[PDB]
Scaffold this motif. Structure first.
Motif, PDB file in Angstrom:
ATOM      1  N   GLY A   1       0.862  -1.063   0.056  1.00  0.00           N
ATOM      2  CA  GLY A   1      -0.137  -0.070   0.089  1.00  0.00           C
ATOM      3  C   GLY A   1       1.101   1.469  -0.167  1.00  0.00           C
ATOM      4  N   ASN A   2       0.303   2.754   0.316  1.00  0.00           N
ATOM      5  CA  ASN A   2       0.781   3.487   0.212  1.00  0.00           C
ATOM      6  C   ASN A   2       1.835   4.224   1.495  1.00  0.00           C
ATOM      7  OD1 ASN A   2      -0.393   4.561  -2.332  1.00  0.00           O
ATOM      8  ND2 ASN A   2      -1.835   5.674  -0.986  1.00  0.00           N
ATOM      9  N   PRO A   3       3.181   4.406   1.143  1.00  0.00           N
ATOM     10  CA  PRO A   3       4.371   4.579   2.060  1.00  0.00           C
ATOM     11  C   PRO A   3       3.465   5.525   3.199  1.00  0.00           C
ATOM     12  CG  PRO A   3       5.095   5.098  -0.179  1.00  0.00           C
ATOM     13  CD  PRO A   3       3.412   4.589  -0.363  1.00  0.00           C
ATOM     14  N   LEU A   4       3.912   4.752   4.456  1.00  0.00           N
ATOM     15  CA  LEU A   4       3.868   6.394   5.862  1.00  0.00           C
ATOM     16  C   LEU A   4       5.833   6.088   5.994  1.00  0.00           C
ATOM     17  CD1 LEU A   4       1.814   5.001   8.265  1.00  0.00           C
ATOM     18  CD2 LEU A   4       0.909   6.376   6.575  1.00  0.00           C
ATOM     19  N   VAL A   5       5.788   8.094   6.393  1.00  0.00           N
ATOM     20  CA  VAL A   5       6.713   7.976   6.597  1.00  0.00           C
ATOM     21  C   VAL A   5       6.849   9.267   7.401  1.00  0.00           C
ATOM     22  CG1 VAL A   5       7.917   8.380   3.959  1.00  0.00           C
ATOM     23  CG2 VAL A   5       6.843  10.123   5.136  1.00  0.00           C
ATOM     24  N   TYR A   6       8.037   9.301   8.244  1.00  0.00           N
ATOM     25  CA  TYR A   6       7.596  10.258   9.460  1.00  0.00           C
ATOM     26  C   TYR A   6       9.073  11.637   9.338  1.00  0.00           C
ATOM     27  CZ  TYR A   6      11.673   7.917  12.104  1.00  0.00           C
ATOM     28  OH  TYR A   6      12.403   7.433  12.204  1.00  0.00           O
ATOM     29  N   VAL A 156      14.389  22.350  13.265  1.00  0.00           N
ATOM     30  CA  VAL A 156      15.144  21.472  12.420  1.00  0.00           C
ATOM     31  C   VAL A 156      14.224  19.819  12.305  1.00  0.00           C
ATOM     32  CG1 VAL A 156      17.207  19.918  11.848  1.00  0.00           C
ATOM     33  CG2 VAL A 156      16.966  22.426  13.310  1.00  0.00           C
ATOM     34  N   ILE A 157      14.169  19.123  11.031  1.00  0.00           N
ATOM     35  CA  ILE A 157      14.111  17.744  11.324  1.00  0.00           C
ATOM     36  C   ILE A 157      15.057  17.090  11.580  1.00  0.00           C
ATOM     37  CG2 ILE A 157      12.937  16.093   9.196  1.00  0.00           C
ATOM     38  CD1 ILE A 157      12.802  18.332   7.655  1.00  0.00           C
ATOM     39  N   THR A 158      15.115  16.443  12.779  1.00  0.00           N
ATOM     40  CA  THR A 158      16.493  15.552  13.568  1.00  0.00           C
ATOM     41  C   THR A 158      16.546  14.455  13.373  1.00  0.00           C
ATOM     42  OG1 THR A 158      14.651  15.302  15.052  1.00  0.00           O
ATOM     43  CG2 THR A 158      16.108  17.332  15.669  1.00  0.00           C
ATOM     44  N   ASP A 159      15.221  13.836  12.724  1.00  0.00           N
ATOM     45  CA  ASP A 159      15.690  12.098  12.335  1.00  0.00           C
ATOM     46  C   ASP A 159      14.145  11.831  11.505  1.00  0.00           C
ATOM     47  OD1 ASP A 159      17.055   9.860  11.753  1.00  0.00           O
ATOM     48  OD2 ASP A 159      14.725   9.152  13.468  1.00  0.00           O
ATOM     49  N   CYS A 160      14.166  11.627  10.233  1.00  0.00           N
ATOM     50  CA  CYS A 160      13.009  10.648   9.270  1.00  0.00           C
ATOM     51  C   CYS A 160      13.710  10.147   9.048  1.00  0.00           C
ATOM     52  CB  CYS A 160      12.842  11.693   8.749  1.00  0.00           C
ATOM     53  SG  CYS A 160      14.385  12.336   7.338  1.00  0.00           S
ATOM     54  N   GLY A 161      12.075   9.199   8.327  1.00  0.00           N
ATOM     55  CA  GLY A 161      12.500   7.653   8.138  1.00  0.00           C
ATOM     56  C   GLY A 161      11.058   7.081   7.498  1.00  0.00           C
ATOM     57  N   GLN A 162      11.287   6.115   7.125  1.00  0.00           N
ATOM     58  CA  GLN A 162       9.663   5.267   7.011  1.00  0.00           C
ATOM     59  C   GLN A 162       8.962   4.394   7.466  1.00  0.00           C
ATOM     60  OE1 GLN A 162      10.677   3.004   3.007  1.00  0.00           O
ATOM     61  NE2 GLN A 162       8.679   2.889   2.363  1.00  0.00           N
ATOM     62  N   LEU A 163       7.846   4.206   7.997  1.00  0.00           N
ATOM     63  CA  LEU A 163       7.486   3.114   8.707  1.00  0.00           C
ATOM     64  C   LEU A 163       6.783   2.591   7.978  1.00  0.00           C
ATOM     65  CD1 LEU A 163       5.264   5.917  10.762  1.00  0.00           C
ATOM     66  CD2 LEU A 163       7.562   4.209  11.425  1.00  0.00           C
ATOM     67  N   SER A 164       5.847   2.532   6.944  1.00  0.00           N
ATOM     68  CA  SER A 164       5.940   1.307   6.090  1.00  0.00           C
ATOM     69  C   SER A 164       5.479   1.613   4.893  1.00  0.00           C
ATOM     70  CB  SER A 164       3.963   0.554   6.743  1.00  0.00           C
ATOM     71  OG  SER A 164       3.777   1.131   6.636  1.00  0.00           O
TER      72      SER A 164
END
Length: 164
Positions: A1-6, A156-164
């Motif tokens: 399905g569609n990605p979830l990112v944070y 600041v975006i201190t961290d980011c990534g993909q959840l699913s």
């Protein structure tokens, strides 16, 4: 399905919280994929450590210039810029995620999250996702902006990534 990112966001070194975004890869696969890869950093560059450099209350919070930090820079995973994929999704309300640009067909890495319905941007900016969780965090970011776009705190975006 569609990605979830944070995106995890700090303001003057103090955590504000997490914004979680759905990327609409079903509708704008090329645009979604660019943002996803910039969140994971898997190409060797991306959003981690970059800032929200332009924040206008009752309008939008803009980020993603990880090269120049002032709205002149950024790059996509495809090259410096890539074309407008389509204008199928609209700026329907608060929480819409849309590509910033410098005119037609100039998408890079800069993006914005809308804090109101911005219907005048329909057909000019590619919408490619929406906030699922963390509108409270977006409202905090908005509160540190001004009419000129200048922020009263360093965001600041201190961290980011993909959840699913």
């Amino acid at each position: 399905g569609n990605p979830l990112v944070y995106l995890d966001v700090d303001a003057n070194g103090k955590p504000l919280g997490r914004v979680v975004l759905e990327l609409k890869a079903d509708v704008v696969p090329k645009t979604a994929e660019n943002f996803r890869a910039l969140c994971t950093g898997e190409k060797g560059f991306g959003y981690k450590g970059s800032t929200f450099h332009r924040v206008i209350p009752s309008f939008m919070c803009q980020a993603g210039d990880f090269t120049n930090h002032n709205g002149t820079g950024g790059k996509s995973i495809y090259g410096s810029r890539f074309p407008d994929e389509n204008f199928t999704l609209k700026h329907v309300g608060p929480g819409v995620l849309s590509m910033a640009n410098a005119g037609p067909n100039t998408n890079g890495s800069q993006f914005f999250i809308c804090t109101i319905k911005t219907d005048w941007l329909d057909g000019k900016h590619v919408v490619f996702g929406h906030v699922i969780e963390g509108m409270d965090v977006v409202k905090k970011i908005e509160s540190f902006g001004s009419k000129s776009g200048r922020t009263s705190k360093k965001i600041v975006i201190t961290d980011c990534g993909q959840l699913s």
